[PDB]
């Protein structure tokens, strides 16, 4: 066991509150001067770490006891649990499918007599999710040896359950942390729609503009006709106000709350509208206030299993809490991030279908969607970067495959930003599977 | 007739900045130029022509 | 004045808007809001901004 240990141990000490201070100048500390046991009280005011044996002050052969045992308990819970989407028994991958709209055709009787069976593919996109974290929590309990540290069963039992409560508390902590990771990751991938703001804390005007932008954005996200932007698939979507959630980084709340809401005569007019949830995250630079559709999170449970085993020889139980989960987010769901500090002129470029798949000598019209943070220009440069035959995308997204193509292509949508002598490219891309066109090949003429 | 610097009241964090806009309520648009100025404080405080 | 450019611009916009809307509904009617230049009258319940 332990021998003598000094009172302190982790005490770094800002200053000597005892002699050098309390017993020095008749100043603020003068108020502690009339105390009789202050020196002792201070000595161990913060408690001690090792209960060294203390003999009784009257009878030296008696030993002072421990009158009270206080087992404290906590329950840590994931704020974001509300965004979990359910359980997955079998399978690894989740397929998310979303259709889109098309272009109206002009009515024409006589020219359509040869077009009854003319056909057109639906504009449908997909994206995938898969199981991610696969971890577990190992925790041993040596119950029969623990018994020696207790007197009453109430405390013994409480303590054992405490260990078990660490399990699942740790799960809640981690789950939460991983969901924050998803946000920061999606952000690092340049996928959130970026709304540049000035650091709100630098000025109440900046804060005010932020508030405006929030409400404006929230409105745009819910317009009945939907919108092509606000998501990473460049698909026309629409969110509902009650389905929008706004993730706020702690302190930002107080900034708003104190400077704006407190003064707002008609509070509601400066309200963030969506379901505001406060976190401690956005572990990045400039990322603050994330506004997303409630279905943006794609969190699923794959495994929650508590395994146990006992080691007869050694009197203990091992607990294994296995937690496997699918951690991801949807790119179809709308997602906007407000960003303070300087941002790039363009954050990302989306190239219509990510999977073209076109027969030899065919073509595919692509459209690039530029997620500019400013409000101007950013003309897209197109490239195929596949083979080298007659393949040649136009000045816009029209692909032009080539009767002799056979390599998968990679359509590039390039936005050149910056100074001519220090250019930077923001490039979006899509791939094209090449299918042989059979007939009308070989030689021609 | 009057000039409305738009941020009626604002608080600025030391080391930060705040652009103010002067709306000039006037008759005809005779290209009335606006002179920006800030009073009080130290030499660390200044204001641009914007 | 392209008001998002200033709270003053915004304010002026609001003033002109409310003023205009009122003019559009004044009892006696007016020709100055039609493309046919005919005396008409609108109602606030019928106005759609």
UniProtKB/Swiss-Prot annotation, chain C:
The chain holds residues 201 to 249 of 448 of the full protein. It is found in: Virion. This is Major capsid protein. Belongs to the phi29likevirus major capsid protein family. It comes from the Viruses. Assembles to form a prolate capsid shell of about 54 nm in length and 45 nm in width, with a T=3, Q=5 symmetry. Homohexamer. Homopentamer. The prolate capsid is composed of pentamers and hexamers of the capsid protein.
């Amino acid at each position: 066991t332990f021998n003598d240990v000094k009172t302190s141990l982790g005490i770094t000490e800002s200053y000597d509150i005892v002699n050098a201070i309390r017993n020095s100048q008749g100043d603020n500390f003068k108020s502690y001067v009339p105390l009789a046991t202050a020196n002792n009280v201070a000595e161990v005011g913060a408690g001690i770490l090792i209960n060294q044996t203390v003999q009784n002050d009257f009878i030296t052969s008696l030993v002072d006891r421990i009158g009270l045992v206080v087992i404290r308990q906590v329950s840590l819970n994931n704020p974001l649990k509300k965004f979990k989407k359910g359980q997955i028994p079998l399978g690894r991958t989740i397929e998310e499918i979303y259709t889109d709209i098309t272009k109206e055709k002009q009515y024409d009787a006589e020219e359509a007599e040869q077009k009854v069976f003319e056909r057109e593919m639906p504009n449908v996109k997909t994206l995938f999710h898969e199981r991610n974290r696969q971890g577990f929590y190992h925790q041993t309990i040596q119950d029969d040896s623990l018994k020696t540290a207790f007197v009453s069963w109430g405390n013994f039992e409480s303590f054992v359950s405490s260990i078990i409560n660490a399990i699942y508390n740790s799960a809640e902590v981690d789950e939460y942390e991983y969901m924050k990771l998803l946000v920061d990751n999606y952000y690092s991938k340049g996928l959130f729609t970026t709304v540049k703001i000035d650091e709100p804390t630098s000025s109440t005007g900046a804060l005010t503009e932020f508030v405006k932008k929030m409400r404006a954005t929230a409105r745009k996200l819910t317009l009945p006709q939907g919108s092509r932007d606000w998501n990473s698939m460049a698909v026309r979507t629409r969110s509902y106000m009650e389905d929008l959630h706004l993730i706020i980084d702690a302190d930002l709340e107080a900034e708003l709350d104190v400077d704006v809401l407190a003064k707002a005569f008609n509070m509601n007019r400066t309200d963030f509208l969506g379901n505001v949830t406060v976190i401690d995250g956005f572990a990045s630079t400039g990322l603050e206030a994330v506004l997303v559709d409630k279905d943006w999170f794609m969190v699923y449970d794959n495994l929650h299993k508590m395994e146990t085993v006992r080691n007869p020889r050694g009197l203990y139980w091992n607990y294994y809490y296995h937690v496997w989960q699918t951690l991801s987010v949807s790119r179809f769901a709308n997602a906007v991030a407000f960003v303070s500090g300087d941002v790039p002129a363009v954050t990302q470029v989306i190239v219509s279908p990510n999977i073209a798949a076109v027969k030899q000598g065919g073509q595919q019209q692509f459209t690039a969607y530029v997620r500019a943070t400013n409000a101007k220009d950013h003309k897209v440069v197109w490239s195929v970067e596949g083979g080298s035959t007659g393949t040649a995308i136009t000045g816009d997204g029209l692909l032009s495959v080539s009767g002799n193509e056979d390599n998968q292509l990679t359509v590039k949508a390039t936005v050149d930003i910056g100074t001519e002598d220090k250019p930077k490219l923001v490039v979006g891309e899509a791939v094209v599977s090449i299918r042989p066109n059979n007939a009308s090949g070989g030689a021609q003429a």
